[PDB]
């Protein structure tokens, strides 16, 4: 084993990430960066983190009957808020900005001329 | 082709947010003059 | 890829466009009032 008790199961048809602790004991204290976060839930061995779109991180130890397991760093970089900086997008952005600024400028010019 | 739709959607979201902010600035500009006129 | 969020982003974009149209109407209306 090599004291690598924490594992991650993925590629499920649903969107979520889960932590499985391979410790053959009960009341296995979970952690997150050296701190008490949540006590083990009995009858279940899969601690829950959330969705992969949230980009979970941090190292997760697992303290069983023996010493603490070596924490498993997790990194996710799913693009939810990634925009596309191709040739077309910049041109559209600049054109819309320029047109809006010109229209607002004409309006405020007429406002000044009136008042 | 879903990723392309995601990129286009977020780009449009940010662009229209910027346009809304510009409209708010212009609303303040006209409101000050309208209040000082009446 | 999961489409459960892309639809939400599309709805948000549509709402932003509606609000932009309303703000354009407001600004046109008040400038016209200043001119009348």
């Amino acid at each position: 084993k090599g004291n690598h008790l924490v594992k991650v199961y993925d590629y499920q048809e649903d969107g979520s990430v889960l932590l499985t602790c391979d410790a053959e004991a009960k009341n296995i204290t979970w952690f997150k960066d050296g701190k008490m976060i949540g006590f083990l839930t009995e009858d279940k061995k899969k601690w829950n983190l959330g969705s992969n779109a949230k980009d979970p991180r941090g190292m997760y130890q697992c303290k069983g009957s023996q010493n603490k397991s070596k924490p498993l760093q997790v990194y996710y970089r799913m693009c939810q808020n990634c925009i596309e900086l191709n040739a077309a997008t910049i041109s559209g952005f600049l054109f819309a900005e320029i047109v809006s600024i010109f229209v607002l400028a004409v309006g405020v010019y007429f406002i000044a001329g009136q008042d | 082709d879903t990723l392309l739709l995601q990129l286009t959607n977020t780009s449009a979201y940010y662009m229209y947010l910027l346009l809304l902010l510009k409209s708010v600035v212009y609303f303040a500009i006209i409101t000050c003059c309208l209040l000082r006129r009446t | 890829v999961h489409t459960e969020k892309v639809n939400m982003m599309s709805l948000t974009v549509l709402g932003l466009r509606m609000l932009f149209a309303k703000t354009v109407a407001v600004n046109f209306l008040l400038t016209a009032k200043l001119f009348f």
Binding site: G92, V99, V103 | L5, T8, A12 | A32
Partner: peptide, 29 residues
Amino acid sequence: LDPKLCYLLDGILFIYGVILTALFLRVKF
């Protein structure tokens, strides 16, 4: 293809509507 063309339609329609309302308001005046 469709979203960009539809946004182009949005922009051109907004500009044309602004221009024609501005032209109508002189005429009724």
